[PDB]
Design an enzyme around this catalytic site. Structure first.
Site, short mmCIF file in Angstrom:
data_model
loop_
_atom_site.label_atom_id
_atom_site.label_comp_id
_atom_site.label_asym_id
_atom_site.label_seq_id
_atom_site.Cartn_x
_atom_site.Cartn_y
_atom_site.Cartn_z
CB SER A 5 -25.38 15.87 -15.57
OG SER A 5 -25.62 16.23 -16.91
CG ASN A 31 -23.30 13.63 -18.24
OD1 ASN A 31 -24.12 12.99 -17.59
ND2 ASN A 31 -23.41 14.93 -18.45
CD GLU A 58 -17.37 16.01 -26.46
OE1 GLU A 58 -17.74 16.85 -25.60
OE2 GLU A 58 -18.18 15.36 -27.17
CG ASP A 99 -20.78 17.08 -20.25
OD1 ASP A 99 -21.37 16.13 -19.72
OD2 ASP A 99 -21.25 17.74 -21.18
#
Ligand SMILES: CC(=O)N[C@@H]1[C@@H](O)[C@H](O[C@@H]2O[C@H](CO)[C@@H](O[C@@H]3O[C@H](CO)[C@@H](O)[C@H](O)[C@H]3NC(C)=O)[C@H](O)[C@H]2NC(C)=O)[C@@H](CO)O[C@H]1O
Ligand SMILES: [Cl-]
Ligand SMILES: [Cl-]
Ligand code: NA
Length: 129
Positions: free
Chosen positions: A50, A59, A35, A52
């Protein structure tokens, strides 16, 4: 902060992620590697507007407030900037809420696509835990 692999494993273990909801520590270290490449400051913008945030790429449409994701929830009750700290406490506490929400770790696309079904214990090999 860019964590080392075993440094992050040790931090996550201390914060209670090992076997949290049945997910062994290696799952969490694997998810963080893909990630964020272990970088607490990572951000990525999504097409829906949005963003992250942080080591687990949490998120802003559901989990934190960044002031620019209209009609979003703040289920972890925190500013998204709290998730970029070198202290992973806020990220871990929020991730525990995410993983309890029904879909398990499938909420993390990189975990689903790159960790799930792999030998995740490899992510903690060699670490003093
Ligand atoms: C790490 C991260 O921020 N991941 C994001 C995902 O969380 C998000 O997917 C959607 O997230 C929530 C929670 O995982 C899901 O909502 C819940 O879904 C279950 C199962 O259907 C339902 O029973 C719950 O009541 C419901 N709770 C709430 C409060 O809504 C949602 O289903 C997830 N996926 C979809 C397709 O809706 C995705 C998408 O925004 O982004 C990730 O970054
Ligand atoms: Cl383990
Ligand atoms: Cl699960
Ligand atoms: Na949010």
């Amino acid at each position: 902060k860019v964590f080392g692999r075993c440094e992050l494993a040790a931090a996550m273990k201390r914060h209670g992620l090992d076997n949290y909801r049945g997910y062994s520590l290696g799952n969490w270290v694997c998810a963080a590697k893909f990630e964020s490449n272990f970088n607490t400051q990572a951000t990525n913008r999504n097409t829906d507007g949005s963003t992250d945030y942080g080591i687990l790429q949490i998120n802003s449409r559901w989990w934190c407030n960044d002031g620019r994701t209209p009609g979003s929830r703040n289920l972890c009750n925190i500013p998204c900037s709290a998730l970029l700290s070198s202290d992973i406490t806020a990220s871990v506490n929020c991730a525990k809420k995410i993983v309890s929400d029904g879909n398990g770790m499938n909420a993390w696309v990189a975990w689903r696509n790159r960790c799930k079904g792999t030998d995740v214990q490899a992510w903690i090999r060699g670490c003093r835990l």
